Amino acid sequence: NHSEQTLYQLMSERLALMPEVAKYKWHHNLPIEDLAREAMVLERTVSRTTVLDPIHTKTFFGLQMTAAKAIQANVFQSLTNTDVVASDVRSLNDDLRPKLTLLGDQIIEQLLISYQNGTPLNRAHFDAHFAHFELNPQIKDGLFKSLELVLTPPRDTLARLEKDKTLRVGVTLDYEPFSYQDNEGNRAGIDIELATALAKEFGYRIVWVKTSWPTLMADAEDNLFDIALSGISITAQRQHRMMFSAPYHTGGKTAIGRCSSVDELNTLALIDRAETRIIVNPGGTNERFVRSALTNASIRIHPDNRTIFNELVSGTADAMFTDSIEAQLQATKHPSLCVLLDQPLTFQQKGILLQPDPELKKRIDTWLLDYLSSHDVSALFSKHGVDPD
Ligand SMILES: [Cl-]
């Protein structure tokens, strides 16, 4: 209630000063971007948010910075042939930036307060609050989802692993390119290789445990696995009772359907009509998206994520919302299929699902962050069919 609004008010007061920032920079022929300042503000923030997850915190303040630079670039458009004068500008260093610094610190204070009091968040309130800002949907989505994860606050799994050296890894094997079976029928994909490298680092052997999108969290709650990987989206709902690793992929949801359909389905407004038959796989973020985002289209839940795309080819449904990486893979695999939208509508990251053991999470992240620094995922991604655009 109270904290949520205050949080939104402070975030909006910052963005509202950004036209003034852009005018000063336009006057002094400065660029929007200033990496010095960005770095420094992000260290200041990290050091001041110790009790909060530092990945979620950096993503949240990171997307505020993106939003702010997008507003600046909109102003830049409007300034091209103007005569800005001293009289028209406000001081960047004595006026605006002090104000922005104060607001940032007040946002941190509200974060910590909300984090300790279990302030609940409402997407409708957020939407209403930021509706007038001139911001692409993914960035708006990102701000809300990241704020949700920041504000989300125990097993002895690592202790057991250290004794038995046997890592039980949950996989769905129904999401190419993350986890699937190859034409010999062996487990394959990004997440098979990542889990193999994690096990190797810790000197564990892997036991593979089959799970599903409908039974993921019950399986996790019953401790049927230690970790799980299969392109699993990081969500505040899934961090109710489990934990995640650092993210290893960033994207979000788009739509796929037939190329012969594109000119009638190339916008969310065109997709969400009662004519349109939506198909979706049960029990994960695809389902939770289409149930929340659509008001008109009909919604069929198809049992098997492996054969769902054939329904679009066959003409028994018209569109599916899924992750951008999956849509682009399936649009390459199927001549008749096309990505329908120009860009994704949501912000979402993939991570390793973990039993809630702090010490497990700590070790896994240390490994993962280092691993990502050193290879490109890009190449692992590309080996399982993912065009590195
Ligand atoms: Cl994606």
Q: Is residue 388 part of a domain?
A: no
- Contact of 234 with 213, CB cutoff 8 Å: no
Q: Are residues 259 and 247 located together in one domain of the fold?
A: no
Q: Are residues 96 and 211 both part of a single domain?
A: no
Number of domains the chain contains: 3
Question: Which CATH number do you get for residue 80?
Answer: 1.20.59.10
Q: How far is the CA of 322 from the centre of ligand 1 (A)?
A: 8
Judgement on whether residues 16 and 115 belong to the same structural domain of the protein: yes
* Residues 265 and 177 placed together within one structural domain of the fold: no
Instruction: With respect to residue 259, please indicate whether it lies within any of the assigned structural domains.
Output: yes
Q: What are phi and psi of 240, to 5 degrees?
A: -50, -55
Is residue 174 assigned to a domain?
yes
Of 101, 129, 150, which marks where a domain is finished?
Answer: 150
Q: How far is the CA of 355 from the centre of ligand 1 (A)?
A: 24
> Per the domain annotation, does 142 fall within a domain?
yes
- The answer on 123 and 50 residing in a single domain is yes
Q: Both 144 and 36 in a single domain? A: yes
Interval between CA 76 and ligand 1 midpoint (Å): 31
Residue range of the domain that includes 80: 2-150
CA of 122 to the centre of ligand 1 (A): 24
The secondary structure of the chain, three-state, reads: CHHHHHHHHHHHHHHHCHHHHHHHHHHCCCCCCCHHHHHHHHHHHHHCCCCCCHHHHHHHHHHHHHHHHHHHHHHHHHHCCCCCCHHHCCCHHHHHHHHHHHHHHHHHHHHHHHHHHCCCCCHHHHHHHHCCCCCCHHHHHHHHHHHHHHCCCCCCHHHHHHHHCEEEEEECCCECCCEEECCCCCEECHHHHHHHHHHHHHCCEEEEEECCCCCHHHHHHCCCCCEECCCCECCCCHHHCCEEEEEEEEECEEEEEEHHHHHHCCCHHHHCCCCCEEEECCCCHHHHHHHHHCCCCEEEECCCCCCHHHHHHHCCCCEEEEEHHHHHHHHHHCCCEEECCCCCCCCEEEEEEECCCHHHHHHHHHHHHHHHHHCCHHHHHHHCCCCCC
Q: Please indicate, yes or no, whether residues 290 and 162 belong to a single structural domain of this protein.
A: no
Q: Is residue 389 part of a domain?
A: no
Between the CA of 102 and the centroid of ligand 1 the distance, in Å, is 35
The coordinates were experimentally obtained by X-ray
Looking from the CA of 56 toward its CB, the CA atoms found within 13 Å total: 25
Q: How far is the CA of 327 from the centre of ligand 1 (A)?
A: 8
Same structural domain for residues 40 and 109? Answer: yes
Residue 271: give its domain's CATH number: 3.40.190.10
Is cis: bond before 177, omega within 30 of 0? yes
Please tell me whether residues 182 and 263 are part of one structural domain. no
Domain end (from 119, 150, 181): 150
What spacing in Å lies between the alpha carbon of 3 and ligand 1's midpoint? 31
Domain boundary among 150, 177, 203: 150
Shared domain check, 195 and 58: no
User: Is there a single domain that holds both residue 305 and residue 161?
Assistant: no
| Contact of 285 with 238, CB cutoff 8 Å | no
Same domain for 75 and 25, yes or no, is: yes
